[PDB]
Amino acid sequence: LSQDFVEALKAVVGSPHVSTASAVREQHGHDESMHRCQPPDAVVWPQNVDQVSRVASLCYNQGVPIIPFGTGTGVEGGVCAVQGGVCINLTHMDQITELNTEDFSVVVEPGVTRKALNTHLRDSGLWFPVDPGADASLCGMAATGASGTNAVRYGTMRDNVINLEVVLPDGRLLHTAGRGRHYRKSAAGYNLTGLFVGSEGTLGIITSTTLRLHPAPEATVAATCAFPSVQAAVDSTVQILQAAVPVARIEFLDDVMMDACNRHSKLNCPVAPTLFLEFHGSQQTLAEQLQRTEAITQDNGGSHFSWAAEKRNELWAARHNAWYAALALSPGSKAYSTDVCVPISRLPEILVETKEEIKASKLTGAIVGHVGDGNFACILLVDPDDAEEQRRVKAFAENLGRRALALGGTCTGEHGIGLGKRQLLQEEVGPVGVETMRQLKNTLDPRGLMNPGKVL
Numbered sequence: 001l002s003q004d005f006v007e008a009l010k011a012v013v014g015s016p017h018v019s020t021a022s023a024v025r026e027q028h029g030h031d032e033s034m035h036r037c038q039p040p041d042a043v044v045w046p047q048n049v050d051q052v053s054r055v056a057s058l059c060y061n062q063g064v065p066i067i068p069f070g071t072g073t074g075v076e077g078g079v080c081a082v083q084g085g086v087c088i089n090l091t092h093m094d095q096i097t098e099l100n101t102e103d104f105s106v107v108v109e110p111g112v113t114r115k116a117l118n119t120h121l122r123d124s125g126l127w128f129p130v131d132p133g134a135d136a137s138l139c140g141m142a143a144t145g146a147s148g149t150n151a152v153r154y155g156t157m158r159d160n161v162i163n164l165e166v167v168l169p170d171g172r173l174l175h176t177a178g179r180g181r182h183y184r185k186s187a188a189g190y191n192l193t194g195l196f197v198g199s200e201g202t203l204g205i206i207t208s209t210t211l212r213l214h215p216a217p218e219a220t221v222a223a224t225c226a227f228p229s230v231q232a233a234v235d236s237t238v239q240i241l242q243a244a245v246p247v248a249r250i251e252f253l254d255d256v257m258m259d260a261c262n263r264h265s266k267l268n269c270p271v272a273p274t275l276f277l278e279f280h281g282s283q284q285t286l287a288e289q290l291q292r293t294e295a296i297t298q299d300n301g302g303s304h305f306s307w308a309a310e311k312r313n314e315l316w317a318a319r320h321n322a323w324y325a326a327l328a329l330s331p332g333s334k335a336y337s338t339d340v341c342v343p344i345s346r347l348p349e350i351l352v353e354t355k356e357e358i359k360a361s362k363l364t365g366a367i368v369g370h371v372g373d374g375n376f377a378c379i380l381l382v383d384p385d386d387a388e389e390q391r392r393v394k395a396f397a398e399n400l401g402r403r404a405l406a407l408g409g410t411c412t413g414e415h416g417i418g419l420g421k422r423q424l425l426q427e428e429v430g431p432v433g434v435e436t437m438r439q440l441k442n443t444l445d446p447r448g449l450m451n452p453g454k455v456l
């Protein structure tokens with residue numbers, strides 16, 4: 001990367017906001033996944049959208065790859081600079097704007113995390129529900145199409161992103177639904193907002209997100225329920241969903257994951273396949289939901305509910321940290337996560353089969369999942385230096401992905417494709433789907449410089 005080019009970057013954002021130092025680049029060459037660190041040639045921190053546009057235009061016209069970087073909590077290598085280039089760290093743009101409580105909407109810049117937003121909304125009666133376990137950039141969550149434990153009731157990022165401000169690869173500024181617009185529904189033209197949700201930085205740089213806010217629940221009850229088997233817990237889940245109980249949260253942990261979470265969070269739950277549940281409503285509605293949900297779990301051997309403000313917070317913090325609890329089982333190890341999502345009636349088959357396959361293999365695995373969506377993660381620890389183990393781990397993850405595809409599902413419910421699931425995506429949507437996706441990529445990024453090597 002030439003000195004003239006570095007000076008041009010510094011001319012846009014300021015000398016303190018450009019770095020070519022080895023250690024700074026290495027810190028931006030990886031995310032939380034096992035994908036090997038591939039450092040960008042430089043890291044740049046733009047301070048406003050005009051600077052994002054000018055950095056993108058500089059890189060694009062000089063043939064330099066661009067890698068958007070939020071909080072680096074992704075798990076599919078999205079920020080790995082596989083072709084070098086300029087990593088654009090967006091988190092100094094950290095303002096909340098256009099809070100419209102009467103309309104249930106807000107605009108956030110990439111440095112705003114869900115914690116920051118919900119703290120800012122404290123005492124407003126509103127909250128933002130999509131809750132990945134990591135303290136992630138909300139614009140990064142839009143870029144990956146994230147979900148969370150609350151999505152079963154309150155929707156994913158795709159359900160709750162109303163508008164996006166996007167710097168296209170060549171620097172042009174796009175407001176996907178129109179500048180300043182926010183509304184409940186539209187048939188005006190083609191829906192561009194949904195194209196950029198889940199684009200993982202390969203179609204442009206999200207510099208603001210307009211988000212749907214939700215009313216805080218009148219009352220909340222959380223509980224845990226222990227089961228004799230994975231089959232019993234997942235059968236309960238399917239039956240709760242088929243009975244249309246509007247549960248706020250329904251999360252599965254297998255016995256391995258529950259033990260790991262116990263050890264990492266000083267919970268003391270019985271070591272068993274377990275559901276973490278939460279219910280929202282009036283006291284009337286809560287009693288009815290609990291009534292109907294306890295009857296279903298009882299039919300499948302579930303324990304009496306172990307009830308959980310402070311404990312509920314500790315319960316869900318333990319769940320949100322499941323990934324780190326799993327990594328702590330074998331210290332020094334990294335991990336890969338699967339993320340399949342299947343039609344809910346097929347969820348018992350594939351979780352029970354996954355548990356059986358884990359036991360039949362030399363691999364360690366913990367299972368945790370947004371099972372209310374038909375989604376779960378297998379977290380597979382890896383010794384970073386054991387090449388034989390890593391390719392058993394990819395073989396396992398790749399077979400699980402293909403089993404989900406055979407059941408009519410998808411290879412990723414929320415994490416995305418990144419570097420890890422590119423072949424599975426080709427199998428998932430077939431040749432005409434791949435070509436159509438590539439045609440969209442090509443019209444927005446003709447030179448192929450927008451996070452190359454990812455998704456397609």
Ligand SMILES: Cc1cc2nc3c(=O)[nH]c(=O)nc-3n(C[C@H](O)[C@H](O)[C@H](O)COP(=O)(O)OP(=O)(O)OC[C@H]3O[C@@H](n4cnc5c(N)ncnc54)[C@H](O)[C@@H]3O)c2cc1C
Pocket residue numbers: 031032067068069070071072073074075077078079090110131132133134136137139140141142143144145146147148149200201202204205206207320321322323324414415451454
């Ligand atoms: C403990 C833990 C729990 C998690 N739980 C969940 C969960 O429940 N659900 C879930 O969906 N994910 C979960 N994740 C994964 C991760 O937090 C999400 O994928 C999150 O959306 C990533 O945001 P980020 O800014 O950290 O992404 P990064 O790693 O910075 O980037 C991810 C990808 O998006 C691109 N990108 C980032 N910001 C932008 C932007 N502004 N514009 C364009 N492209 C951009 C990057 O180029 C990259 O390809 C979890 C991760 C951890 C570590």
Ligand SMILES: CCC[C@@H](O)C(=O)O
Pocket residue numbers: 075133319320322323337368369370377379
């Ligand atoms: C990063 C894999 C686990 C994550 O998806 C979660 O559900 O907490």
